[PDB]
Amino acid sequence: MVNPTVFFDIAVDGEPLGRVSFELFADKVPKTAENFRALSTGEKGFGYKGSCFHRIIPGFMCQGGDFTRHNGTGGKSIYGEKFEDENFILKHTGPGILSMANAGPNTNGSQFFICTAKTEWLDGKHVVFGKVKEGMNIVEAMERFGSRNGKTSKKITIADCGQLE
Amino acid sequence: PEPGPYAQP
Fold first, then answer.
1. Least CB-CB distance to B5: which of A59, A113, A148?
2. List the disulfide bonds (chain A).
3. Strand pairing of A112-115 and A5-12?
4. Half-sphere exposure of A125 (CA within 13 A, CB side)
5. Å from A100 to nearest chain B CA?
6. What torsion do the CA atoms of A25, A70, A10, A89 make, to the nearest 10 degrees?
């Protein structure tokens, strides 16, 4: 239902571990969905290539991001540094939850995170925009390179892009 | 201590 799919190749140390496509619910949350879509294609002058999952915790979530202004942002939006959410439709009631990372409300639009587990303690907070439709096994494989403190023993970069639309 | 969610005390 006018849902864009964003496709990536997930690579550990540059070596393709697999590939993950995410269904963006643009019919529900058009702002936060098209935001990440325009980051990944980079038509807004950003071109998010090689996006490194540098912050991953097992039994929780695998979070990716970029080197551009890594301090305090590290993966800014088409709204720039940070923006406020459109509407809190999509709750974190499932696995593979693709949602852009934040410190809180009006601080969304810096990096992204994929909740490998159903993180329900993230309800009443920043809304989801997409979910892993294919490659959830690769997402939980990324999780296995992460550490409890947020450390990543392996350098998991988004090798390539090419959204299925 | 960064833009990102938390869990696991």
1. A113
2. none
3. unpaired
4. 18
5. 9
6. -20
Active-site position among A102, A108, A111, A145: A102
- Cα-based distances in Å from A62 to A25, A83, A135, A148: 20, 22, 13, 11
Distance CA A18, CA A139 (A): 9
- What residues pair up with A20 in beta bridges, in sequence order? A8
Residue A136 identity: M
Other Cβ atoms closer than 10 A to A26: 18
Decide yes or no: CATH 3.30.465.10 for domain A1-165: no
Give me the residue spans of the domains in chain A.
1-165
CB pair distance less than 8 Å for B4 and A113: yes
Do residues A108 and A84 touch, judged by C-beta distance below 8 A? yes
Q: Experimental method for this entry?
A: NMR
* Neighbour-count burial for A57-96, b at 16+ CB within 10 Å, e otherwise: bbebbbbbbbeeeeeebbbbbbeeebbebbeeebebeebb
Concerning whether A87 is annotated as a catalytic residue, the answer is no
